[PDB]
Coordinates of C-alpha atoms and ligand atoms in Angstrom, one line a residue:
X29 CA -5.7 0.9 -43.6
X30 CA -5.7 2.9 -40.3
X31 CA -2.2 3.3 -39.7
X32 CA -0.9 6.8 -38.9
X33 CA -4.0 8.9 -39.5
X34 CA -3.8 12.6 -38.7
X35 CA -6.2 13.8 -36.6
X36 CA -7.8 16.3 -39.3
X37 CA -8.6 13.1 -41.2
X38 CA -9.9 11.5 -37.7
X39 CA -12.3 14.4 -37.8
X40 CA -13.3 14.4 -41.2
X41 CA -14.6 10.5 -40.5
X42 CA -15.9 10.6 -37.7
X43 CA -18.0 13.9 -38.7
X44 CA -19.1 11.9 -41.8
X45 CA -22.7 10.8 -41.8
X46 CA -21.7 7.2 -42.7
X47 CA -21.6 5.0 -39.6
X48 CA -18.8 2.7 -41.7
X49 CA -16.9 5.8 -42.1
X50 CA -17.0 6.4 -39.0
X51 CA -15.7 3.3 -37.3
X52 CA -12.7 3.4 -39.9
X53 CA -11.9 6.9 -38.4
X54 CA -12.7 5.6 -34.9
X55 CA -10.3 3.0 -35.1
X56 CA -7.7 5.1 -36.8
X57 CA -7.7 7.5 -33.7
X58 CA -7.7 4.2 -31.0
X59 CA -4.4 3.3 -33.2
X60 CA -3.2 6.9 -32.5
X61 CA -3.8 7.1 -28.8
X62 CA -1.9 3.3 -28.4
X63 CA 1.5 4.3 -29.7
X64 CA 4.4 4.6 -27.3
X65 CA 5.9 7.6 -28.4
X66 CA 3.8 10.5 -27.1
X67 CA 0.3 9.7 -27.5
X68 CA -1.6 13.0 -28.8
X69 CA -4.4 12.5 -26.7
X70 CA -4.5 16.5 -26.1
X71 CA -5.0 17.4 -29.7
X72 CA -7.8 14.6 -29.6
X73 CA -9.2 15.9 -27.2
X74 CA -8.9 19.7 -28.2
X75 CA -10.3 17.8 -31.6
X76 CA -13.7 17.8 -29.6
X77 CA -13.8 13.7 -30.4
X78 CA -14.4 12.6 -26.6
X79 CA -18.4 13.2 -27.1
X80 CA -18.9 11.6 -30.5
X81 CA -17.0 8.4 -29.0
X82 CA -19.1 8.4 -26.1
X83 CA -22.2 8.6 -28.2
X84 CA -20.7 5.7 -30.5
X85 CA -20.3 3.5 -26.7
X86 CA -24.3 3.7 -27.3
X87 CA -24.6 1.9 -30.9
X88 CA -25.5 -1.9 -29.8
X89 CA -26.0 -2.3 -33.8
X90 CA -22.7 -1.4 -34.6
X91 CA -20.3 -3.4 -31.6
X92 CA -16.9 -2.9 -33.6
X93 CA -18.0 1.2 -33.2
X94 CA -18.5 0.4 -29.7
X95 CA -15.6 -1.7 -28.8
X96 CA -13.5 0.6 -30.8
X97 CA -15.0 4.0 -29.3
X98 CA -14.2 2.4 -25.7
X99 CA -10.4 1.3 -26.2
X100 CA -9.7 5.1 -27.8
X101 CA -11.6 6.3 -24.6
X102 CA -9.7 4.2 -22.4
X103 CA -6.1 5.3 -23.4
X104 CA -7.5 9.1 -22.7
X105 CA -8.8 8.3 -19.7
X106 CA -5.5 6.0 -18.3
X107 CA -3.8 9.7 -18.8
X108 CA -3.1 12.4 -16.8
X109 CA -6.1 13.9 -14.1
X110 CA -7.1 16.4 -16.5
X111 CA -7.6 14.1 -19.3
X112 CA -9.4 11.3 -17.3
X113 CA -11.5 14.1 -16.1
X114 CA -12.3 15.2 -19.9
X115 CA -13.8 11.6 -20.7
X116 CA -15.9 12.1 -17.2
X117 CA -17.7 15.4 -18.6
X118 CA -18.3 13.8 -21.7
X119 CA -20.8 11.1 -20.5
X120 CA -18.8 8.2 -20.3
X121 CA -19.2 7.0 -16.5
X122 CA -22.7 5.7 -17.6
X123 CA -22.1 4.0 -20.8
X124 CA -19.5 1.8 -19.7
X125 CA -21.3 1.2 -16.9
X126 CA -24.3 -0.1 -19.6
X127 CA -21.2 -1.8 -21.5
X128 CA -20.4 -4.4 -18.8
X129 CA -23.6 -6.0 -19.5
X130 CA -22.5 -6.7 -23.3
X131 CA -22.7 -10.2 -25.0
X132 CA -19.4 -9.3 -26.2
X133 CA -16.2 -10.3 -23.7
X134 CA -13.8 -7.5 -25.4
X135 CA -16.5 -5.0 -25.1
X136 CA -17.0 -5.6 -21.2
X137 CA -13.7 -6.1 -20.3
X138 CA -12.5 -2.8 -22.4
X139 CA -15.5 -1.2 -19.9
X140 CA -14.1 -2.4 -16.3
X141 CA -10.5 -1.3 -17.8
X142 CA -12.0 2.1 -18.4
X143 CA -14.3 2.4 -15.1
X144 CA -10.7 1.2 -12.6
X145 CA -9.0 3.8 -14.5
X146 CA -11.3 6.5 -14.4
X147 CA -12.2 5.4 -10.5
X148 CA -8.3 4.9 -9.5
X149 CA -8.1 8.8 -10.8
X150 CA -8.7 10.0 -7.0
X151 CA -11.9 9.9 -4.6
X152 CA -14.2 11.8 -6.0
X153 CA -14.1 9.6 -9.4
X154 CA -14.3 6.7 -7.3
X155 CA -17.2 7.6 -5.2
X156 CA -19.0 8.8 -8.4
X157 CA -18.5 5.3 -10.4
X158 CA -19.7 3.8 -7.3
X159 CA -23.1 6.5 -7.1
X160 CA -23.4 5.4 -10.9
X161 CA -24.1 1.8 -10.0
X162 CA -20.9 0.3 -11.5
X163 CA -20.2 -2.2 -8.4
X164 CA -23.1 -4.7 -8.5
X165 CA -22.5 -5.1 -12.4
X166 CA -18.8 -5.6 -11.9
X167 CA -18.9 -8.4 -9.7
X168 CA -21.9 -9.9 -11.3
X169 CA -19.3 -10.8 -14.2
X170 CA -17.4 -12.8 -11.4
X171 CA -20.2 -14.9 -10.1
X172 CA -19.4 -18.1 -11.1
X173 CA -18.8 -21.3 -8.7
X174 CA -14.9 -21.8 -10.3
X175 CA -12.8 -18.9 -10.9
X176 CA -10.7 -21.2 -13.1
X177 CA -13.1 -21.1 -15.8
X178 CA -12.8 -16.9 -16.5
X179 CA -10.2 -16.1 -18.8
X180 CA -7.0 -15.4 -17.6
X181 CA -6.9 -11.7 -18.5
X182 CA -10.6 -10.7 -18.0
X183 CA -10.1 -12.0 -14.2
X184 CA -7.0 -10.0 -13.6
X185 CA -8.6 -7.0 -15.5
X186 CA -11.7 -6.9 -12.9
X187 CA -9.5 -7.6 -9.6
X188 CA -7.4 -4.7 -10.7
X189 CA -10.7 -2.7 -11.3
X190 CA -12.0 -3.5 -7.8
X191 CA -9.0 -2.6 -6.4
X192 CA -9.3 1.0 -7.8
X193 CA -12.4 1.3 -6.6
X194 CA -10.7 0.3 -3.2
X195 CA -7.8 2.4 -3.2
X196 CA -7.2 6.2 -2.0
X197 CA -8.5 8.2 0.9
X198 CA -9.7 11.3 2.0
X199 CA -12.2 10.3 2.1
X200 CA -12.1 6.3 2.1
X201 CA -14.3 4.3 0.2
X202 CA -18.3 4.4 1.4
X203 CA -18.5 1.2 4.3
X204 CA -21.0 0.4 2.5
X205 CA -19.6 -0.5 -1.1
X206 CA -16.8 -1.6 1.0
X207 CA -19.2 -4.3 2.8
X208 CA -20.3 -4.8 -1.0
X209 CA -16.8 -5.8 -2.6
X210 CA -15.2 -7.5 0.1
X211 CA -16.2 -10.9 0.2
X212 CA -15.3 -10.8 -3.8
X213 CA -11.9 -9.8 -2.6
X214 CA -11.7 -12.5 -0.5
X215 CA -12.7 -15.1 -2.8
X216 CA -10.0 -13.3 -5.2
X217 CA -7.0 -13.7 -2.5
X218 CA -7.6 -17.5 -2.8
X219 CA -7.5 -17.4 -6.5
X220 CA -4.3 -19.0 -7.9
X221 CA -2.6 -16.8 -10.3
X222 CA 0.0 -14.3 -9.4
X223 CA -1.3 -11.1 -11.0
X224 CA -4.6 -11.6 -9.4
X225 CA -3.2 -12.0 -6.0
X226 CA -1.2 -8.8 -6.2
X227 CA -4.2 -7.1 -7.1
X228 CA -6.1 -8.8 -4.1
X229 CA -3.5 -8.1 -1.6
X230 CA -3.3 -4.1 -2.9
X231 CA -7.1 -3.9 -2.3
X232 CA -6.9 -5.5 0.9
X233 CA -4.2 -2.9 1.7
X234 CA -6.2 -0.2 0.6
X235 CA -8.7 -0.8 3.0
X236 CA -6.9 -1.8 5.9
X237 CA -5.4 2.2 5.7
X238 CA -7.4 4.2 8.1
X239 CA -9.0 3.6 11.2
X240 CA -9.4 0.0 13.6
X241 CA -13.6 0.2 12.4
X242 CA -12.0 0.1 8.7
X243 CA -9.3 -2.8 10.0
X244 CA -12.1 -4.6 11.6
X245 CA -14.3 -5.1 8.6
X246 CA -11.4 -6.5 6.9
X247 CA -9.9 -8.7 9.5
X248 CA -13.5 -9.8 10.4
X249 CA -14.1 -11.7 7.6
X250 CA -11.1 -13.9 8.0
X251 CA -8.6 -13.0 5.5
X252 CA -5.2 -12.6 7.9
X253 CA -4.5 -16.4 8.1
X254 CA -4.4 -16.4 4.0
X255 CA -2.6 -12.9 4.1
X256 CA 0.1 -14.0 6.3
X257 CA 0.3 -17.2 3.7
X258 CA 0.9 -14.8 1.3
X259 CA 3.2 -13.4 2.8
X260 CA 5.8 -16.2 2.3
X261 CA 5.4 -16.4 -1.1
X262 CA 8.5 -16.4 -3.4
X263 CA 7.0 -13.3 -5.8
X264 CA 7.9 -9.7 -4.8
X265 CA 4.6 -8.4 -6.2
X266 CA 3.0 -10.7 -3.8
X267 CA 4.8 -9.9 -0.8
X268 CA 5.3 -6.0 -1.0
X269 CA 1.4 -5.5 -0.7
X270 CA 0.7 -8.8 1.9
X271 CA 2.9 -6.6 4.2
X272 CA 1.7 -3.5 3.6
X273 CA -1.6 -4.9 4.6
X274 CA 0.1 -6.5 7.6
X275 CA 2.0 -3.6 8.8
X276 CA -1.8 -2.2 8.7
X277 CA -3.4 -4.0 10.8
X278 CA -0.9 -4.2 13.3
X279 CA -1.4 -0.4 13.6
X280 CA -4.7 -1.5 15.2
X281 CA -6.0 -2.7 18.3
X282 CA -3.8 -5.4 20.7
X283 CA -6.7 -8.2 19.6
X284 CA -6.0 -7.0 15.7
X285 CA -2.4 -7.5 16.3
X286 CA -2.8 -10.6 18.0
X287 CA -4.6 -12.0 15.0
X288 CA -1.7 -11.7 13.0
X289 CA 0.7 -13.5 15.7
X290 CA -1.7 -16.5 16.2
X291 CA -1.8 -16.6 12.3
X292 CA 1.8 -17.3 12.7
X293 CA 3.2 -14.0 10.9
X294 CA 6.5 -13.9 13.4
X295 CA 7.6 -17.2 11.4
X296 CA 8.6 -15.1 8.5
X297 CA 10.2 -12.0 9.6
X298 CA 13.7 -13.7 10.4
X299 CA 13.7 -13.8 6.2
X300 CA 11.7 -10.5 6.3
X301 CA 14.2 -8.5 8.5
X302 CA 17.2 -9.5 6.2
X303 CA 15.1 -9.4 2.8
X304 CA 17.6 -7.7 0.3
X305 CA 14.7 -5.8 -1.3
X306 CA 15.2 -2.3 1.0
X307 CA 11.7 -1.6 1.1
X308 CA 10.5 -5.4 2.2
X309 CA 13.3 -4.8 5.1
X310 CA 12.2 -1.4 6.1
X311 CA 8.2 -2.4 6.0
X312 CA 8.9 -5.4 7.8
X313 CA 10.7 -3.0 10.3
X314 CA 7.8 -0.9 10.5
X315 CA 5.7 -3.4 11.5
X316 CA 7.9 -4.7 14.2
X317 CA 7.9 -1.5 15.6
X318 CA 3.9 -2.1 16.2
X319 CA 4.1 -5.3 17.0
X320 CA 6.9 -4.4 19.9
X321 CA 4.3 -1.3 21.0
X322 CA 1.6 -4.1 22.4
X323 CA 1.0 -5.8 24.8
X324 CA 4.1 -7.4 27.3
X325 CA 2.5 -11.1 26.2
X326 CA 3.0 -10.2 22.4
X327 CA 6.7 -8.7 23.1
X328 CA 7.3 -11.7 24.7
X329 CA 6.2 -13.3 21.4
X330 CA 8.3 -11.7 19.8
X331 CA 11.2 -12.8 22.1
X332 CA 10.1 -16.2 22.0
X333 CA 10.1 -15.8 18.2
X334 CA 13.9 -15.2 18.1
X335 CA 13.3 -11.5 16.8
X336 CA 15.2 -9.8 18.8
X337 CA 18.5 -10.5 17.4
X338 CA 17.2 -9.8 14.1
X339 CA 16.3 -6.3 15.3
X340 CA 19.4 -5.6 16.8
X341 CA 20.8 -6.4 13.4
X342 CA 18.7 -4.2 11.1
X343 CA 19.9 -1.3 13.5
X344 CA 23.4 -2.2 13.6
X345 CA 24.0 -2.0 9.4
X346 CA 20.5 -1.2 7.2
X347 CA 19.4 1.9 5.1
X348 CA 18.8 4.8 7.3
X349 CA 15.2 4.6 6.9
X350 CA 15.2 1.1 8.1
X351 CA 17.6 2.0 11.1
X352 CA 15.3 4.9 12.0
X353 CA 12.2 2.1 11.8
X354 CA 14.4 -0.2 13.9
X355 CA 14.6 2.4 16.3
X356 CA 11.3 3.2 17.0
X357 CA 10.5 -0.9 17.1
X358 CA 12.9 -0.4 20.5
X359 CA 11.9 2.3 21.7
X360 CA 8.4 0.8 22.0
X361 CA 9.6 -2.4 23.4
X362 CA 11.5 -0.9 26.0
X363 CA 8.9 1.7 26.9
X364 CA 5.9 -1.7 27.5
X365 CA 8.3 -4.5 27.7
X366 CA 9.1 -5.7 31.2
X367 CA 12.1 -5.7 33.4
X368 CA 13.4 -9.0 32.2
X369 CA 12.4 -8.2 28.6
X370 CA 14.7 -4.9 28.6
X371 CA 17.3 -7.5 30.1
X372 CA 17.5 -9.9 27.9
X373 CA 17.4 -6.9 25.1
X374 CA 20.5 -5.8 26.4
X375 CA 22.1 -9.4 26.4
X376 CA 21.5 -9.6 22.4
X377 CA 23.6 -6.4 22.1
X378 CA 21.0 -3.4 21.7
X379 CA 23.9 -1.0 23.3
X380 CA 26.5 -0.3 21.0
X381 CA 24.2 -0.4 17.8
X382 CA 21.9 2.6 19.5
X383 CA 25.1 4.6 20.4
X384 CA 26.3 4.4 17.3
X385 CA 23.2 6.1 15.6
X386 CA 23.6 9.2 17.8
X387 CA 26.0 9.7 15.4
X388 CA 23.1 10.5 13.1
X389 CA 22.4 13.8 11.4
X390 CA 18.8 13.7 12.4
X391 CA 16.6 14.8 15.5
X392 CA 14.0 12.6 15.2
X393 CA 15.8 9.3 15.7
X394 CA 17.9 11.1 18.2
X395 CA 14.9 11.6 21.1
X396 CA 14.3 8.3 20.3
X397 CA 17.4 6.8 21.2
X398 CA 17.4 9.0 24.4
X399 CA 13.5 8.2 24.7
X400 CA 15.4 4.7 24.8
X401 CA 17.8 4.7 26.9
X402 CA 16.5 6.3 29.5
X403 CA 13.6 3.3 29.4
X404 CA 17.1 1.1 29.6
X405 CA 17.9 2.6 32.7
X406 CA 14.7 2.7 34.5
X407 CA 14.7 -0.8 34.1
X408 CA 18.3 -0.8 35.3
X409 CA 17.5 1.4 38.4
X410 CA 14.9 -1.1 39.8
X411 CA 17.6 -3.8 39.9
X412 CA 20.3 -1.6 41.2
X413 CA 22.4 -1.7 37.6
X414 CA 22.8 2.0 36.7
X415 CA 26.5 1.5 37.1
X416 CA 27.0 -1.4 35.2
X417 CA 25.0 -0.1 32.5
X418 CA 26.9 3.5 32.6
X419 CA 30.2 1.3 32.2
X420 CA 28.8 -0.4 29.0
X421 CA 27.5 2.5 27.5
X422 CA 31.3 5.0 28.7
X423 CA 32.7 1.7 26.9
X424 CA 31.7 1.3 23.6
X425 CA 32.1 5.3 23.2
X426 CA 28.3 6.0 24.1
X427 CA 29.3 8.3 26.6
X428 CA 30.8 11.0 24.1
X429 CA 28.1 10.8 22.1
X430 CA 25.5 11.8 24.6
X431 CA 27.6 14.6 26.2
X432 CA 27.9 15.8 22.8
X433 CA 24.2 16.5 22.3
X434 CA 23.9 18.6 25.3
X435 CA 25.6 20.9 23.1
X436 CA 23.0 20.6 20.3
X437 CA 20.7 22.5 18.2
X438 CA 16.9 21.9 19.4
X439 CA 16.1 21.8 23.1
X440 CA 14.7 18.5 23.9
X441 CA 17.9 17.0 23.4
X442 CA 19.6 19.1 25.1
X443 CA 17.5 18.8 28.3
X444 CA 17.2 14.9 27.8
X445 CA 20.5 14.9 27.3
X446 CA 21.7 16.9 30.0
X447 CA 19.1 15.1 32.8
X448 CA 21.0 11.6 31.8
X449 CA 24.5 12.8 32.2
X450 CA 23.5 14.7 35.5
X451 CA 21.8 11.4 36.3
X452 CA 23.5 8.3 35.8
X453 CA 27.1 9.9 35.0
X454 CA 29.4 10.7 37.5
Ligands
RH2_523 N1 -0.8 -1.8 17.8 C1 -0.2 -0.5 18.4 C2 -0.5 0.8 17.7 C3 0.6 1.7 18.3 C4 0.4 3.3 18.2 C5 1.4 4.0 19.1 N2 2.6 3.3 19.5 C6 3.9 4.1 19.3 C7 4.2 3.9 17.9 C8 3.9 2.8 16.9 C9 4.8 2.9 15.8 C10 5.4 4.2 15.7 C11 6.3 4.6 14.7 C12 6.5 6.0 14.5 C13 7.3 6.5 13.6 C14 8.0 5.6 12.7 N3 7.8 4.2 12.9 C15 6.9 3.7 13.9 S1 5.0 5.1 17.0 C16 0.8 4.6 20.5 N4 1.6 4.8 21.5 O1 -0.4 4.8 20.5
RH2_524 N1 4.8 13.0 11.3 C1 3.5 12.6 10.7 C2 2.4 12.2 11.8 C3 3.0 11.2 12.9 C4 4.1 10.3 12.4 C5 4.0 8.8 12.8 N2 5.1 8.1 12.1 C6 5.1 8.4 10.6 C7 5.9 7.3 9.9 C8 7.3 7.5 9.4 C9 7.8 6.1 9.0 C10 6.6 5.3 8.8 C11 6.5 4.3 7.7 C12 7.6 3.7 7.3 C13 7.6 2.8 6.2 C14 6.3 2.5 5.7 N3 5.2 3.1 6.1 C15 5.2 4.0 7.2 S1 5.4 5.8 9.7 C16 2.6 8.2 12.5 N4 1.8 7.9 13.6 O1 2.2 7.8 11.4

């Protein structure tokens, strides 16, 4: 029937003054544009079909046109920029905005696929679905008192929509349609299927991106406690974006940050820290390092939490990246922590694993081992332990290493280098 048309024979169809025609040919180029092997959206496109398919969108007499006119639009518009943009010029923003309304489930739910696409494309796209009016129709198809009773796939299909409409920067979303969506998003991250969760957790990561006014909206309305739930669960796509959103907020403000400890997030970042997923290990390390950059009380949480072994261990053996994570988590702790607290980091074994990474082609992670050190010994120097401290670090071959960078590429090194041999060494 509509297998393998070519597109000449698209056009003749669809340019046919017969509406039944027309929906064959329609249909014909939606099965065209949904084959794996190199989709010829270009020549579809080139074809000049993208406007007669938007007008089709229009046809409430004829919903197999419309439904069929909307997938075909959709699998342009899930393409690459320029092609999403090519559906945006031809009208379609609007009419599937007008679609979401439709009697017919397919036919709304092929809309909010093609308006999260077409808004996931980048901010401007987003910012003009929203000026188009597409956000109080969207969540008016979720307004029901049990999420249970929507279909599987339409629910998944609208929390992935929302969470375009969520998603990039530069700018962030409008406050105000973020005010609008969220406490849909939080009904969402309660909802109990996986795919929807994901989705949930993305969006809340989203918009916990950016400033403490953008992480205070968010953590306002109460979601961390559910968050940090989520956080344990056994699903990777679960867990990757609850600590994303996590490591967010802990970027914020010490009562932010607190929020997340009181919700009892600590608990899980023994199993965090030694997750063998690299990037679960090196996010989780990330947001140590901003949890150990607060206040003394919440490094002492994190004490008190048994963490601090577990950070000495991510620096002694993990991917680089982690490592460099891990270092900055100390730095930060040493730099706020108290004299006792830098004591009792040297009793779990920080030393030799920091020494041991000045080994490291990199500058960065370099200053901040120094950065560290010298914290080490500040601490050291108001209890009179320079000495035994220099011993432990001429010991396990820490010494060599630092001498080593005086003779070193960029000059900060040098010069924090040089000032602690001169200072604490002989
Ligand atoms: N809730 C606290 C927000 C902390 C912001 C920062 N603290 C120093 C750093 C935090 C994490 C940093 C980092 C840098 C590079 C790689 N990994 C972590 S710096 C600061 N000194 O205002
Ligand atoms: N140099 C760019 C501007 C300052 C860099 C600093 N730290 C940047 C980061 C590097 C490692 C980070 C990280 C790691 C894993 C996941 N997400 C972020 S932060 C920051 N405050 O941003």
């Amino acid at each position: 029937g509509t297998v393998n048309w070519s597109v000449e024979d698209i056009v003749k169809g669809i340019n046919s003054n017969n509406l039944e025609s027309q929906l064959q040919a329609t249909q014909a180029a939606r099965k065209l544009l949904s084959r794996e092997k190199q989709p010829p959206i270009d020549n579809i496109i080139r074809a000049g079909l993208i406007p007669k398919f938007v007008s089709f969108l229009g046809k409430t007499d004829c919903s197999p046109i419309q439904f069929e006119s909307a997938w075909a639009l959709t699998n342009i518009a899930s393409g690459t920029s320029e092609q999403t943009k090519a559906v945006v010029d031809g009208g379609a923003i609007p009419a599937f905005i007008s679609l979401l309304a439709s009697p017919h489930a397919h036919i709304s739910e092929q809309a909010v696929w093609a308006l999260g696409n077409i808004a996931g494309d980048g901010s401007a796209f987003r910012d003009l679905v929203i000026k188009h009016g597409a956000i109080d129709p969207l969540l008016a198809l979720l307004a029901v008192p049990d999420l249970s009773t929507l279909a599987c796939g339409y629910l998944r299909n609208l929390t992935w929509t929302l969470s375009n409409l969520c998603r990039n920067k530069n700018p962030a979303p409008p406050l105000d349609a973020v005010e609008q969506i969220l406490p849909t998003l939080v009904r969402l991250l309660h909802h109990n299927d996986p795919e929807v969760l994901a989705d949930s957790c993305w969006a809340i990561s989203y918009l916990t991106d950016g400033p403490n006014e953008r992480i205070e909206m968010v953590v306002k309305k109460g979601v961390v406690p559910q968050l940090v739930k989520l956080l344990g669960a056994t699903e990777l796509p679960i867990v990757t974006p609850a600590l994303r959103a996590i490591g967010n907020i802990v970027t914020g403000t010490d009562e932010q940050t607190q929020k997340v400890i009181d919700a009892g997030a600590l608990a899980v970042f023994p199993s965090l820290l030694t997750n063998p997923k690299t990037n679960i290990q090196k996010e989780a390390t990330w947001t140590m390092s901003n949890i150990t950059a607060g206040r003394q009380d919440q490094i002492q949480q994190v004490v008190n939490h048994g963490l601090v072994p577990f950070l000495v261990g991510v620096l002694s053996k993990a991917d680089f990246k982690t490592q460099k994570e891990a270092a900055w988590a100390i730095t930060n702790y040493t730099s706020g922590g108290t004299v006792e607290q830098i004591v009792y980091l040297v009793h779990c074994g920080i030393i030799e694993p920091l020494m041991n990474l000045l080994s490291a082609k990199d500058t960065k992670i370099i200053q901040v081992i120094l950065d560290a050190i010298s914290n080490i010994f500040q601490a050291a120097e108001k209890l009179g332990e320079t000495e035994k401290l220099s011993i432990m670090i001429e010991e396990c071959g820490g010494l060599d290493k630092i001498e080593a960078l005086q003779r070193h590429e960029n000059e900060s090194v040098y010069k924090a280098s040089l000032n602690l041999i001169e200072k604490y060494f002989s």
